[PDB]
Structure 1
Amino acid sequence: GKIEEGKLVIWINGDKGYNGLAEVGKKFEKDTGIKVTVEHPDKLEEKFPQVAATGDGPDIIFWAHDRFGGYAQSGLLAEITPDKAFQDKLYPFTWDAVRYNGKLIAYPIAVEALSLIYNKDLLPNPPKTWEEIPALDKELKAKGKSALMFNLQEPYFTWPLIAADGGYAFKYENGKYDIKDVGVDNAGAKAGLTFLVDLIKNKHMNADTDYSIAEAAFNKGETAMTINGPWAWSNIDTSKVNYGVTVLPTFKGQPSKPFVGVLSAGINAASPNKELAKEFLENYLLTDEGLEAVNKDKPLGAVALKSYEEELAKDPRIAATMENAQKGEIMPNIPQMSAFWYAVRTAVINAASGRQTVDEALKDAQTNAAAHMLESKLIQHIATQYLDGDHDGLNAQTPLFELNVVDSASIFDLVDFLRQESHVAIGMHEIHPANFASVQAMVALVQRLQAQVA
């Protein structure tokens, strides 16, 4: 076939320990005689679907799990077959991240999540609850320093508190994310966003803190704690700060829920070398020896193999990562997450500013999530149906009456698509060029009509 039999080719990104991985390949070669090539090509996460669709590419590819949903949707990744006793060797929740439509489609390797990062000097015993930070802020403000500063512009950093009492992005019970059940306006999320908003109202945080500003104030020793991930550690190090990394505070007695990214190894569905790859992944890479080789090349962080995690979890920073990850929520591997992110970004910006109540901000977030998803559905519809499949520059703001889309009769087809997908009636008097000026305009129409009916 297009892939060479009796060999392993592996793609992993350049920032990873590939020299370590190669050394594992050389151990595998020593025992089986099978050679193992480890490559780090540019944009390999875009090449891979393109070469795998044709029946080519690496035997094994490494990437964070969320990308593997689209590869699975396209059928590009073999269903892996670990036995129950091998699965038992990894933290159970890492297996949730490599499931797709009820099949296992990759092996979990390593795991990444936010933690609380604190100044041992200014705060030698960090707080365990959100509820005690307003106090610790006063008694700390009274000496020219603040308690907590972290990036409030990006929902990645604020969602752990918001989800703590019950918010969620997309519900999945069947190993299947339900993209119409979006858990952004429920009792939990309101409790937690209210608390984030009451911190800003009460002078404990500032609504315009972003990533660079929080990272600067903490490395300058001007604040006791920030929220960040293992990527920020080396900057703290260079800093001379006396820093620790621990459990995220609880809210309403419940753990904060950061999103978890899970670095995974999947097997090319087009590879003839499936059992060679499983043998290499279970019996050579996913062992204390395999993982240490890679980890001593470039650190992996908190790893999914229980035995080797207990070793590296001696580093209490790394113990923090895994702990917050276990208490968190797996990043959904579907495309509609970009709709969640957009909806949550706006909702939190507007609530923090006082522009919107927490209530109206989160009900909008439900509305904007649905709007953003129709937009994607409508762009793809137009691309497939009137543009011979060319997603070229066609975005929500593109003038349709310019493009060769709205025919004499095709307008009726667009209207009825809007009807089929939103279950709202569209009268003749709404079929005019301001409503059909762009995809954005078409979606605004649908949501104005739904708002009118309710």
Structure 2
Amino acid sequence: KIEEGKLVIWINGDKGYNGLAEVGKKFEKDTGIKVTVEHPDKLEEKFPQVAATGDGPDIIFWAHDRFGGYAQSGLLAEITPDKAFQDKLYPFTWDAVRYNGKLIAYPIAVEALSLIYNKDLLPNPPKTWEEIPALDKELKAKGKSALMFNLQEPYFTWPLIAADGGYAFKYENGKYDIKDVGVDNAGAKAGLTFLVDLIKNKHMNADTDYSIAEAAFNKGETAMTINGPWAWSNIDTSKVNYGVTVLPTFKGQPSKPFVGVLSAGINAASPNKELAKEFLENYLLTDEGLEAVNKDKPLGAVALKSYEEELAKDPRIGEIMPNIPQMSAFWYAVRTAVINAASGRQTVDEALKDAQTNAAAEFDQHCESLSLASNISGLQCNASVDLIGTCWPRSPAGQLVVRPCPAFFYGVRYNTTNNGYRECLANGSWAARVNYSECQE
């Protein structure tokens, strides 16, 4: 259970959590309420695990794309800012945290990946991806490399995959079409083929993660990286002379990074909702609060109008992501495809074919048709194919179901006069196990 009368906040460790903690310390001094800021690894997966039990933080910070899934699980409280507060943030930031009519988070910052480059190694950064192989060749003769970035997280390769035509879900009839997935079209194939080719030709290493790339850039070993504004603070420190610019073009088409709105959701099981609202609206979402965070690690662009007007003067300072529940399937699909293509485990074609399936994993067909004369009232188990390939028909909850034994199983004859048995449970889920004992060899 969550402790009443304090605030526990979770934010990713790459964000300005020390700056956030200072806003927390001021809130503590003014209220006598302890604020604890924590930053567990993989928070975006840990949050729903812990929260569905009524545990977790009072406030969770992530990019808005995760929030639709959280809200559908009932994990997030609906937020209640007055029209006057709403007016202080840009309309489009509110749009990103609106799910099925309701505001489900406060928008904080607008996050976009950029090309970060070392001005000493590369006074003019490339305008195209296509010139990077030649540039790497020149740099290798000097014991440097052109480009290193995180290949383990699909957020960083997506801009190139999307450039020539890849997309997540198509916006059709005023809503994202979850059946229309674009991870396996010509443009997605072309983008990923380029990336694999960079690796095949030793211009990049498949195993490059966040830390190899950040260290490589900051030690002056690579001329370019790809990252968000939060990363600038670490470069500042390193005293590499760096510039920030737009991602290069692929086949003459701009790179297309997926844009995130860092947002702050309130845990539906928190007994501290009015405290969390007060902290967010009156302490964090002020010029002074956002400045405190920005000073730790840059936010880039922010949702708050008054502070964005100051920030827009920064020279260092692409589509908004959907917030739909299917975004986690999408990211998981692309992650897997990229890692498999980059490591040679699959071809680009194979990888992206699997990605299309996995991104649309919520949607087999033949089994549903083979028993559509049923009309059952109340709880039912849906048509389902088991691991052996046996089709279990739509059945009432609380009933044992009987289907013949498969004619063939791994190229093996079985007598179809025998049956297998499966219980459709009282709650409308299939029993995990099927009794196949009777299907004699």
TM-score over 0.5 (shorter chain)? yes
TM-score normalized with structure 1 length: 0.63
Distance 1:17-1:144 versus aligned 2 partners, 3 A rule: closer
Per-residue deviation, 1:99: 1.9
Distance 1:393-1:59 versus aligned 2 partners, 3 A rule: farther
Per-residue deviation, 1:101: 2.0
Per-residue deviation, 1:121: 0.2
Find the aligned partners of 2:98 and 2:256 in 1 and give their Cα distance: 20
Deviation string, structure 1 residues 100-141 (Cα, Å, up to 9, x no partner): 123221110123343212111011121222233234334444
Find the aligned partners of 1:309 and 1:11 in 2 and give their Cα distance: 24
Deviation string, structure 1 residues 10-62 (Cα, Å, up to 9, x no partner): 77789876786687689889999999998999999899879987999987654
Find the aligned partners of 2:305 and 2:437 in 1 and give their Cα distance: 53
Per-residue deviation, 1:243: 2.2
Distance 1:202-1:390 versus aligned 2 partners, 3 A rule: farther
Distance 1:218-1:276 versus aligned 2 partners, 3 A rule: closer
SS in 1 for 2:223: strand
The answer to which of 34-43 and 137-146 deviates more is 34-43
Per-residue deviation, 1:370: 4.5
Per-residue deviation, 1:264: 1.7
Distance 1:151-1:62 versus aligned 2 partners, 3 A rule: closer
Does the CA-based 8 Å contact 2:165-2:188 persist in structure 1? yes
Find the aligned partners of 2:233 and 2:126 in 1 and give their Cα distance: 24
Q: Which of the pair is proportionally richer in strand?
A: 2
Give 5+ residue unaligned stretches, structure 2. Answer: 389-397, 414-428
Distance 1:343-1:303 versus aligned 2 partners, 3 A rule: same
Per-residue deviation, 1:184: 0.5
Find the aligned partners of 2:90 and 2:207 in 1 and give their Cα distance: 38
The answer to which of 266-275 and 136-145 deviates more is 266-275
The answer to which of 344-353 and 103-112 deviates more is 344-353
Supply the RMSD in Å over aligned alpha carbons: 8.1
The answer to which of 431-440 and 23-32 deviates more is 431-440
Does the CA-based 8 Å contact 1:342-1:369 persist in structure 2? yes
Does the CA-based 8 Å contact 1:119-1:244 persist in structure 2? yes
**Aligned twin of 1:438:** 411
The answer to which of 117-126 and 354-363 deviates more is 354-363
Does the CA-based 8 Å contact 1:115-1:245 persist in structure 2? yes
Distance 1:240-1:25 versus aligned 2 partners, 3 A rule: closer
The answer to which of 256-265 and 54-63 deviates more is 54-63
Does the CA-based 8 Å contact 2:367-2:384 persist in structure 1? no
The answer to which of 14-23 and 187-196 deviates more is 14-23
Does the CA-based 8 Å contact 1:383-1:390 persist in structure 2? no
Deviation string, structure 1 residues 204-246 (Cα, Å, up to 9, x no partner): 4344444444334433433211223445445545544222232
Per-residue deviation, 1:174: 7.0
Per-residue deviation, 1:409: 14
Find the aligned partners of 1:331 and 1:33 in 2 and give their Cα distance: 38
Per-residue deviation, 1:309: 2.5
Distance 1:174-1:36 versus aligned 2 partners, 3 A rule: farther
Find the aligned partners of 1:28 and 1:203 in 2 and give their Cα distance: 51
Distance 1:69-1:379 versus aligned 2 partners, 3 A rule: farther
Per-residue deviation, 1:162: 0.3
Distance 1:193-1:174 versus aligned 2 partners, 3 A rule: same
Distance 1:449-1:330 versus aligned 2 partners, 3 A rule: farther
Per-residue deviation, 1:167: 1.4
Does the CA-based 8 Å contact 2:145-2:203 persist in structure 1? yes
**Aligned twin of 1:39:** 38
1:226 equivalent to 2:199? Answer no
SS in 2 for 1:93: helix
Find the aligned partners of 2:366 and 2:136 in 1 and give their Cα distance: 52
Find the aligned partners of 1:179 and 1:51 in 2 and give their Cα distance: 27
Per-residue deviation, 1:350: 4.3
Per-residue deviation, 1:159: 1.5
Distance 1:91-1:46 versus aligned 2 partners, 3 A rule: same
SS in 2 for 1:266: strand
The answer to which of 299-308 and 240-249 deviates more is 299-308
Per-residue deviation, 1:177: 4.8
Distance 1:358-1:389 versus aligned 2 partners, 3 A rule: same
Does the CA-based 8 Å contact 2:364-2:384 persist in structure 1? no
Does the CA-based 8 Å contact 2:230-2:297 persist in structure 1? no
Find the aligned partners of 2:96 and 2:87 in 1 and give their Cα distance: 15
Per-residue deviation, 1:173: 5.1
Does the CA-based 8 Å contact 1:101-1:175 persist in structure 2? no
Deviation string, structure 1 residues 70-121 (Cα, Å, up to 9, x no partner): 4311334344455777556434443343121232211101233432121110
Distance 1:63-1:200 versus aligned 2 partners, 3 A rule: closer
The answer to which of 137-146 and 21-30 deviates more is 21-30
Per-residue deviation, 1:193: 1.9
Distance 1:265-1:173 versus aligned 2 partners, 3 A rule: farther
TM-score normalized with structure 2 length: 0.64
**Aligned twin of 1:424:** none
SS in 1 for 2:370: helix
Does the CA-based 8 Å contact 1:435-1:445 persist in structure 2? no
Find the aligned partners of 1:306 and 1:67 in 2 and give their Cα distance: 24
Distance 1:25-1:201 versus aligned 2 partners, 3 A rule: closer
1:16 equivalent to 2:15? Answer yes
Per-residue deviation, 1:428: 20
Per-residue deviation, 1:300: 4.2
Does the CA-based 8 Å contact 2:17-2:296 persist in structure 1? yes
SS in 2 for 1:249: coil
Deviation string, structure 1 residues 369-393 (Cα, Å, up to 9, x no partner): 456xxxxx79999999999999999
Distance 1:449-1:295 versus aligned 2 partners, 3 A rule: farther
Does the CA-based 8 Å contact 1:380-1:391 persist in structure 2? no
SS in 1 for 2:62: strand
Distance 1:378-1:205 versus aligned 2 partners, 3 A rule: closer
Find the aligned partners of 1:25 and 1:379 in 2 and give their Cα distance: 51
**Aligned twin of 2:91:** 92
Per-residue deviation, 1:163: 1.1
Per-residue deviation, 1:146: 2.9
Distance 1:58-1:349 versus aligned 2 partners, 3 A rule: closer
Does the CA-based 8 Å contact 1:383-1:389 persist in structure 2? no
Does the CA-based 8 Å contact 1:161-1:193 persist in structure 2? yes
